Every structure is written in structure tokens, then in C-alpha cells.
């Protein structure tokens, strides 16, 4: 649980994406929420101003305010404020979902995708199975740490990491019970970097290796942090006096959900 | 993720319990699983001997072996072994559920309950709401740390912890978003102790304060650890030579799930 020092704003995005085995994009979907936590009663009568760079009228985002939030003020001035102007935000450090958004992209469109994936597979010359290469490319401006690739098989023989055809990435098998099968973790994917993970694994036929799932999650704590899709906060202000600014912090996060090659 | 040095056995129990507001027990349900992680191929042709103190013919536990585990050997000798004797356990550190159990208990039966609960409520003399007392009694031999009580309300005013009628002057509101509402944490519940948490919270009527939920979790890493219900391991052995014992570790855990007063 991140600490709140009064007002803590969390901008949480989750990304789904599906790739054919050759790397062709099938689909993607990004879901976002803006959560407000307040733990100082003197700061509960507050309004959030979103960054000017956000088009709050972009229909492809389906921005939806919480029932108790004033939709018209959001749409007009990019302000998050209560629909009932006498009331105040709950101020016992509860995570308050105040705004949500969702956007989809179709086949062959990479606009929502932080990490592209392609696989190459061929029958192994050693194990009863396959020599896999997962190729990845990040378009993020920050590193991804502790990225986990899962293959849906449970082999009788150990997986053999082929370090000679992998990015030096501390690759190792890890226990990861959020996904079914055998999991390999890589230490880092550098900003804008392309790499590869290579290994040999037992499976009865090629198609049994799929879907391969990737799992990653990053977050940044910084008042000026911008989400993957550009969500950000311009200021926080008293509800009854918009010239009076209040102290706050912001966390942005991006997490994979159904992020796979099939 | 706990580290595995070869073989790691996890005995995980989850407890559901429901109480009337006056503390009368309505029901309870305990679920358990025994998970095996193996990350050294040399240890993969292994069999687990459960502790001699366990009764594997207690039908009220509905002991259920994984489809690949040999039910007759479990029942006959308390042995966890594969139903296909030519195979070995997957040895890429995957969590392998080998055995599960479940037991229920009815109204007024405390045999499965680690922590009994009772509540007392009255209108407050300060806030627009209620003076609450939650009384608890542990029957565990070890302390519970960081126990969280959740009340399903989101009050305008801050919660006021009544330290004069609480055991842990120390209790504090915390963010806990696994349960909906306002959450108060207590630092410790000592082994075998009875104590209380007292606070004042705003709500529109008494019945709005319910269900109150409690959240707790404890775990121990020790070869000789026993679970809540007494599950434990006697040894681990080569599948083909039961005199040849293998190195291993054991983690036991107990977690609340639907644990409430209503």
C-alpha cells in the first residue's frame, strides 16, 4: 500500500493485447481509473484539475465519471468535483474511483501497445519439444523490470534457457501462480529496447505452447507523472476557492492483464 | 514469492466464518491445499509422507487428491505419489496442488474458528453516528499481526479511535481496498488473548454498519510446521527408495476470506 501524506491520486491503466505467433496484432484494449485517496480531513473539500493536454470529449475513451462526480464540470473545465457542492470527499484513506476510461484498437494497430511480441519456434534437436524464441520490443520511455513470460505446459524435463540467443537479462524460471504453466522472468526490458528470450521446452505439439502470456507492471510516483495514455493532474484546489491550491502526490501505473501470443 | 532451495511444500488454509452481531456463530468453512514446488530435477522423483498424526480417513475433511496423484497410496500410507509410477513431478518451480480438503461447521460450533467476534453499538455523543465496540478472542497459539476490520460506510467525518476502550492504543485507519468501506488496523492480537477495538464512526442507521469484515493472515516457514487443522509433513523420500530421504522445506499459512459479522 503506497503511503498517502494527505491527498494521493492514482492513475491506473491496465492493458490487454493479443498477437498472432508471427507478431501480427489482433487486438488491444486499455482500461483506466483515476483513484483519489484522502486521509486529512482539512483536504477533503477539494477538486482535481486534469492536465490541459487531455481531450475529455474524446469519445473513443468513453470517459465516465462516478455517479457522485459532476459530469458537466468534467466535460467543461476538466475538473473533478462533487455533484453536491456542499459535500466533501470521504477522508478516511479510502480509494475513491472518480473517473474511468476504456479504449480499443483493432488488428494491426500498435497505438495502445507498450511491448510488441513475436515468436519463432522449431523442433528441438535435444528435448522432445521445441526451441522457442520470444522476441520483444518496448516502445516505453522507461524500463520494464521483472517481466514474466509463461508457457502453458508442465514439462517432465527442466526448461533449458538458451543464454546464447537471449538478451543478457538474468533470465530464470520463477514460480508465478497468477498464470498456469511454466514461467520465466527477465530482469529488465530497457526503454525503447528490443531483445529476445530463448529456451528449449518439452511439449507434445507446437500448438500446446500457446497461448504464451506476458506479465508486467510499472509505476511512477511524481506529481507530474503522466499515464501511458497521457492522463495527468494540473493541480488540486479547494472546492470553494480555486485559487487556493492544495498539496498532493500522484502515482501512475501500467499493468498487463490478458497480454498474450496465441 | 518464497524461495525454493529444491523442494518447497506449502500448506495453505483459508477460513470463512459468519457471526450474528451478538457474537453467535452462524457458520464456518475451512479450505485447504497442499502445494508442492520443485526446482531441482534430481528431486522430482519424490514422494511426500504426511505426518503420522493426520487422519486421512476423516471423511468430514473430504480429502481429495489431484487426478495425477494416487488416491489409494494416500489413503493406505499417507503418501503423496504419482498415479503413473513412470512419471516425475514437474520440476520448473510450478506450484502443484496435490491435495485439498474442506470442512464445514454449523451454528454455535467454534471448532474451526481461530478468532471469535462480537459487536456492541450505541448512538454517539459527538458524531452523527455510532460508538462501536468490536470484541475479539483468539484461540491461536501465535500472534496475529496487522488485523484489519472493515466497516461498509464512507463517512464525511474522520473516524475517532476510542483508545480508552481498545486493547491496542495504536489502532489506525488504513487504506485496504480488498474490502469496501472504511478500514482500521490493529497491530497485534496476542496468542490466546481477548481484546477489543472501539471507535466512533458516522453512519445513517445502525444496520448500515454491517456486515463488518475482518482480514488476517499468518504464515510460518519451518520443516516441522503444522497448519491450523494439524496438516504437516513427516518426510520426503525417493519414490523408488523410501529409506532415501530428501532435503525440503515447508511453509504453513492461514488466511481469512469471508470472515464477517452481520
Amino acid at each position: 500500500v503506497p503511503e498517502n501524506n494527505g491527498i494521493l491520486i492514482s492513475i491506473k491503466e491496465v492493458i490487454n493485447a493479443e498477437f498472432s505467433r508471427d507478431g501480427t496484432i489482433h487486438s488491444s484494449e486499455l482500461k483506466g481509473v483515476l483513484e483519489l485517496r484522502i486521509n486529512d480531513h482539512d483536504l477533503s473539500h477539494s477538486n482535481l484539475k486534469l492536465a490541459d493536454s487531455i481531450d475529455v470529449r474524446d469519445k473513443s475513451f468513453q470517459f465516465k465519471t462516478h455517479p457522485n462526480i459532476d459530469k458537466q464540470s468534467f466535460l467543461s473545465t476538466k475538473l473533478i468535483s462533487l455533484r453536491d457542492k456542499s459535500k466533501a470527499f470521504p477522508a478516511n484513506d479510502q480509494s475513491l474511483g472518480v473517473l474511468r476510461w476504456r479504449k480499443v484498437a483493432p488488428a494491426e494497430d500498435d497505438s495502445l501497445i507498450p511491448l510488441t511480441l513475436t515468436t519463432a519456434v522449431s523442433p528441438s534437436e535435444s528435448q522432445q519439444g521445441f526451441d522457442v524464441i520470444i522476441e520483444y520490443e518496448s516502445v516505453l520511455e522507461t524500463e520494464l523490470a521483472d517481466v514474466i513470460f509463461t508457457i502453458p505446459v508442465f514439462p517432465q524435463e527442466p526448461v533449458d534457457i538458451n543464454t546464447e540467443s537471449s538478451t543478457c537479462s538474468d533470465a530464470e524460471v520463477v514460480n508465478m501462480d497468477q498464470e498456469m504453466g511454466t514461467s520465466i522472468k527477465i530482469s529488465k526490458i530497457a526503454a525503447n529496447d528490443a531483445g529476445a528470450l530463448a529456451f528449449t521446452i518439452e511439449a507434445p505439439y507446437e500448438d500446446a505452447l500457446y497461448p504464451m502470456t506476458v506479465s508486467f507492471q510499472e509505476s511512477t510516483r511524481d506529481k507530474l507523472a503522466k499515464s501511458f495514455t497521457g492522463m495527468a493532474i494540473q493541480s488540486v484546489v479547494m472546492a470553494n476557492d480555486h485559487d487556493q491550491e492544495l498539496p498532493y502526490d500522484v502515482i501512475t501505473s501500467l499493468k498487463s492483464d490478458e497480454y498474450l501470443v496465441q | 514469492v518464497p524461495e525454493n532451495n529444491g523442494i518447497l511444500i506449502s500448506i495453505k488454509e483459508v477460513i470463512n466464518a459468519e457471526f450474528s452481531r451478538d457474537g453467535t456463530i452462524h457458520s464456518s468453512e475451512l479450505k485447504g491445499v497442499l502445494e508442492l514446488r520443485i526446482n531441482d530435477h534430481d528431486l522430482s522423483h519424490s514422494n511426500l509422507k504426511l505426518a503420522d498424526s493426520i487422519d486421512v480417513r476423516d471423511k468430514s475433511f473430504q480429502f481429495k487428491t489431484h487426478p495425477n496423484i494416487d488416491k489409494q497410496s494416500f489413503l493406505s500410507t499417507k503418501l503423496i505419489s504419482l498415479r503413473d509410477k513412470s512419471k516425475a513431478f514437474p520440476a520448473n518451480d510450478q506450484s502443484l496442488g496435490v491435495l485439498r480438503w474442506r470442512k464445514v461447521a454449523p451454528a454455535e460450533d467454534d471448532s474451526l474458528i481461530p478468532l471469535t467476534l462480537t459487536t456492541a453499538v450505541s448512538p454517539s455523543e459527538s458524531q452523527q453516528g455510532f460508538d462501536v465496540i468490536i470484541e475479539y478472542e483468539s484461540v491461536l497459539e501465535t500472534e496475529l499481526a496487522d488485523v484489519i476490520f472493515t466497516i461498509p460506510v464512507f463517512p464525511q467525518e474522520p473516524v475517532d479511535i476510542n483508545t480508552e476502550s481498545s486493547t491496542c492504543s495504536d489502532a489506525e485507519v488504513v487504506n485496504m481496498d480488498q474490502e469496501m468501506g472504511t478500514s482500521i488496523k490493529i497491530s497485534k492480537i496476542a496468542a490466546n488473548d481477548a481484546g477489543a477495538l472501539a471507535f466512533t464512526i458516522e453512519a445513517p442507521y445502525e444496520d448500515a454498519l454491517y456486515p463488518m469484515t475482518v482480514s488476517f493472515q499468518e504464515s510460518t516457514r519451518d520443516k516441522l510446521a503444522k497448519s491450523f487443522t494439524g496438516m504437516a509433513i513427516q518426510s520426503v523420500v525417493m519414490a523408488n527408495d523410501h529409506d532415501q530421504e530428501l532435503p525440503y522445506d515447508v511453509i504453513t499459512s492461514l488466511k481469512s476470506d469471508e470472515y464477517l459479522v452481520q
Binding site: 457522485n68 459535500k87 470521504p90 474511483g97 | 464512507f154
Partner: peptide, 6 residues
């Protein structure tokens, strides 16, 4: 976190 009310 979309059940909150007041």
C-alpha cells in the same frame, strides 16, 4: 473502488 457513496 466504485461503490463509494455519500
Amino acid at each position: 473502488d466504485w461503490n463509494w457513496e455519500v
